[PDB]
Structure formats: structure tokens, C-alpha cells
Write an enzyme that holds these catalytic residues in place. Sequence first.
Site, PDB file in Angstrom:
ATOM      1  N   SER A 274     -49.289  38.704 -14.249  1.00 54.29           N
ATOM      2  CA  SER A 274     -49.827  37.335 -14.410  1.00 54.29           C
ATOM      3  C   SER A 274     -51.135  37.138 -13.723  1.00 54.29           C
ATOM      4  O   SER A 274     -51.845  36.200 -14.043  1.00 54.29           O
ATOM      5  CB  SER A 274     -48.866  36.304 -13.868  1.00 54.29           C
ATOM      6  OG  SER A 274     -47.776  36.319 -14.761  1.00 54.29           O
TER       7      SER A 274
HETATM    8  C1  LIG Z   1     -46.525  36.915 -14.368  1.00 54.41           C
HETATM    9  O1  LIG Z   1     -46.515  38.012 -13.853  1.00 54.41           O
HETATM   10  N1  LIG Z   1     -45.411  36.253 -14.604  1.00 54.41           N
HETATM   11  C2  LIG Z   1     -45.287  34.856 -14.981  1.00 54.41           C
HETATM   12  C3  LIG Z   1     -44.595  34.192 -13.806  1.00 54.41           C
HETATM   13  N2  LIG Z   1     -45.330  34.455 -12.551  1.00 54.41           N
HETATM   14  O2  LIG Z   1     -44.596  34.039 -11.490  1.00 54.41           O
HETATM   15  S1  LIG Z   1     -44.897  34.518 -10.050  1.00 54.41           S
HETATM   16  O3  LIG Z   1     -46.348  34.781  -9.927  1.00 54.41           O
HETATM   17  O4  LIG Z   1     -44.459  33.460  -9.099  1.00 54.41           O
HETATM   18  O5  LIG Z   1     -44.206  35.790  -9.732  1.00 54.41           O
HETATM   19  C4  LIG Z   1     -43.197  34.774 -13.734  1.00 54.41           C
HETATM   20  C5  LIG Z   1     -43.248  36.280 -13.515  1.00 54.41           C
HETATM   21  C6  LIG Z   1     -44.158  36.993 -14.521  1.00 54.41           C
HETATM   22  C7  LIG Z   1     -43.536  37.125 -15.879  1.00 54.41           C
HETATM   23  N3  LIG Z   1     -44.339  37.367 -16.912  1.00 54.41           N
HETATM   24  O6  LIG Z   1     -42.330  37.021 -15.992  1.00 54.41           O
END
Ligand SMILES: *C(=O)N1C[C@H](NOS(=O)(=O)O)CC[C@H]1C(N)=O
Length: 539
Positions: A274
Site C-alpha cells: 500500500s
Molecule cells: C496495503 O498494503 N494494504 C491496504 C491496507 N493497509 O493497511 S495498513 O497499512 O494499516 O497495514 C490493508 C493491508 C494491505 C492490503 N492490501 O490488504
Amino acid sequence: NRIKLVPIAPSRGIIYDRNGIPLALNRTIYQIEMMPEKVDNVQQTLDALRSVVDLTDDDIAAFRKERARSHRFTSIPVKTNLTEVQVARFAVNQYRFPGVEVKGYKRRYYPYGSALTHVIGYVSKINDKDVERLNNDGKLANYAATHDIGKLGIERYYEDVLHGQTGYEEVEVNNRGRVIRQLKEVPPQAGHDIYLTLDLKLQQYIETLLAGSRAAVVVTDPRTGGVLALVSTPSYDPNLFVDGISSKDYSALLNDPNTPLVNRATQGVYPPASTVKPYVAVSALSAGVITRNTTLFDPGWWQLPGSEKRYRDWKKWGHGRLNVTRSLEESADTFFYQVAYDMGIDRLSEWMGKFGYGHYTGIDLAEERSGNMPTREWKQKRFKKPWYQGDTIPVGIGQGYWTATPIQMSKALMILINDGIVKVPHLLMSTAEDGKQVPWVQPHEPPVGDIHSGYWELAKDGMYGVANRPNGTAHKYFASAPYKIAAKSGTAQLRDHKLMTAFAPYNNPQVAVAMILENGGAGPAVGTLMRQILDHIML
Ligand SMILES: *C(=O)N1C[C@H](NOS(=O)(=O)O)CC[C@H]1C(N)=O
């Protein structure tokens, strides 16, 4: 009486942090040595040396064996690491021991040890691949008297400047080959001193924060691209290698399952996840496939057109109505799944490659991995299967085939801070010796996208939201800071890798941080460690 030329080794340059603290020093170490062929009566000499330098049976044991394991007319050490009293005692007795020599060797010393292992490196004994690499580079001539060499880190990347210019002396030798007089001396020239961008107290603090975890932290000044700290844990003591590492000690390092030999900051290869959403966003706005006002309704998932293939958001039932701002704030996946589909892998890789992913960053270390920003041509070369549209989708949220290093994360983060201006992360501030300072000069890196455009502020405003607004994923870590923090986290793929990027203050950013705790780290959450680091810096 013949006249011999004898190379004189240069003194290795000093490495200093950004405040002039020496990080890599030289120490002189004294030994007496002999070529037994040039010593009239070896046994007599050894026994009389018991009195003079406190020579021991064990010293002699080690002598005779090393005498065996050596070529004819090799200078065998007799006693090493002499104390200053012992050197003085030998000195006033030198005339009794023709053919025994007392010699000083500069050895390298690392006062702050494991806090700087991966970034500074160590120097240790030259081996046959060093010889080979020097002989290809056509540098061997200048090592006639040099026996150690930079093995990794700054010590290796800057070996050439640190080493200096070998000198030489003309000495007169008698029938039996003992030096009696020095005729002329053309002195060596010390290597250059190098001044690094590192803040030593910041690096020790971070190393303290990371205790117990497999982790990497890169802290940069985005105004300059300098590396204020680059730490990889677990680490180890670089002094171990300088005087020759025990094979017991060395097998303990390789056999550590926490692999402390790996520089995680430059060779740690992970899905950026992310943390890429801000750069994917800027890219989509520039490409024109989204807008500040583009909106979609997220039910918690996203379906590939013409397919039953559904990709999930992390929020089981969705974020409702999403624009790019709110998607960054809550790290929505559905919005970026769509952005990826619309961008196409071609445009998407081309843009992410312009943020540095898949390429070497240009940092001045030689330990680096390029990661992988996938393309059609790469998938074809690597698997001889063509690109399928479902391969594009996970790339939208920094997954799929996409892998990056924390130093790559750093480069990308700084580009976003500088509105598309590409600043190479570097460690060198300046070189010196002989008194002339040469500053590190940025290579020509054309900017990414366009500077005047307002998309940079949009994506950064979202990162501000992650850290400050009540729905941002990192509110609990950063909202209560006096200075304004902007951040973006990610989670990758035993437990999950926790990643965090951030910069501060938001108005006029002075520091940028990319970090990752493998499998979540051993203690605090990566967001708590980020706050503490940003606190330490900003006070
Ligand atoms: C990105 O890696 N994601 C979206 C979201 N990010 O949350 S976190 O930064 O608090 O860990 C959830 C995890 C992840 C995803 N794609 O599931």
C-alpha cells in the site's frame, strides 16, 4: 651492495559523519617478524627474545607452524600485538637481532560497531577475488604494500578514494639481504577523508529502536537526498573481520536464521504493498485516467471486466463512496484495482519505473538489489507466458509481481515530496585530501511527470490524512504530533511484513523515512517506531 625499491603503504582515509565524528579510524599494531633465512641462528634468537618481548612457547609454536604454512623467503611474524613497553624493549635491543624486524601496521577500528555495520562496512584481509577484481580494474600496481581492502558498505564503495597512493623507498641491503640504510623515500599519500551525510546519534537511536527485529530503516533529508540513517537489523560487530574473523564467529553469522549479513535497507526485497498508493495516484492523475473528483462505490471487492475474477478490499464490506483522497486516507484497494485496470500494465510500469521501482537507486553502496517492477516483456522473458489482465490488478496495490527495497521506497517517497524532482539517495557529503573538498554532485535525473501540476499536493494531502484525519489508517500513531506528519503504511504478503513511510513536517518536509519490520517486528508496531523516530528528529 644492491639498492632495492620497497613500496610504502598509504594511510587509509578517515570516514566522518555529518558532524565530523570519525566513524572509521586507524590504529597502529606492532609485531616483530623475521625471514628465517636472513636470521643467522633462529633458535638463539627466539630464546633471547623471551627476555626482550616476553616471547612465549605458544608464540614460538605459532611461529614454526606459520613458518611451515609459508613460502620460501616469507617474513614470518614472531610476536603480534606487542605492547608499547615491548616495542621499546625490542627497540633498545634491535642491534642484537639482525634479521628480526619490528613493524607497524595500520589496522581499521570501528568505535560505534554494529550501529554502522551495513552502511560503513569493514576492511579486512585481501583475498584472491579482491586480487582478481583489482587486476581487472587495473589497480593492482597501487596495492604492492596494501593487504586489506573495503569489503562492503562505504569502505568498499569508496575504496579507491579511501586507499591513497602507494609510495616507495630505496634501501641498501648487504650480502645476506638485511637493510642497512634508507637512501631515498618518496612518501605515500594518505587516502582522502570522506564526510558522510549520516547522523551517528540518529543511527544509534534507530538501532536501539529496532532491537530484536529483522528490519530496515532509511531516513533521508528530501531537501538534499542525503541518508541521515540507513540501518538494517539484526547487525553484527564489523571489528570482528578487521584482524581476521574466527571461523567459529563467522559460521555463527552465516548460520543465524535472522541473516545479519544481509543489508535489508538495500538488499531487502519485499512487496511495497500500500505504500505505493500515493505514487500510483499521482501517476493516474497525470495519465488522465482519474481526477480529483473521480468516484466509485466500493462494496468491499472489485471484479475484472469480462471475468468472474474478483479482487478484495481489506474492508470486508467496502469503504462506500471513494475518491483518490479518501482511498489514500483509508488505504482502499478497490479504488486502485480500478486505477490499475484503466492504466494498463504498460503505462503503470512505465510510471512506477520513473519513481525508481525496478531500478537501482544510485546510492553509493555496492550491496543493492533492483527489486522488480513487472512489465509484459519481463513476464514473457521470465516465464514464456504472456501478460494477462488479471496480472495488472494486484500491481495497483503494490503486490502481485511487484517487489522493492526500502532504499527504493525512500527514493520514491522523496520524489513525491519534491513534486517529481528526482533526488538520488546518497551517503557521501564531501571528499577531502589534500585539503580540497569535492562535494557529491547529483547525476542528471530528469523529473517525473510535471512540477507545476497539482497532483503532487493531492497525493500528499491524502498522506496527511492517513496520519491526521480520524479515518486515516495511521491516526493513532501520528495525529497528536505538534509538527505535522504525513505517512503511508502498507502490509505485505509466518506473519505479515509491516511497512511504513512518512515525512515531516508536512508544510516544509525536513526528513523522509521508509522502514519495514519483517513479520511485524519483535515489539512495537511499525507506526509506533515511526512516531518515535520522527519525534527524536524533530524533538
Ligand atoms: C496495503 O498494503 N494494504 C491496504 C491496507 N493497509 O493497511 S495498513 O497499512 O494499516 O497495514 C490493508 C493491508 C494491505 C492490503 N492490501 O490488504
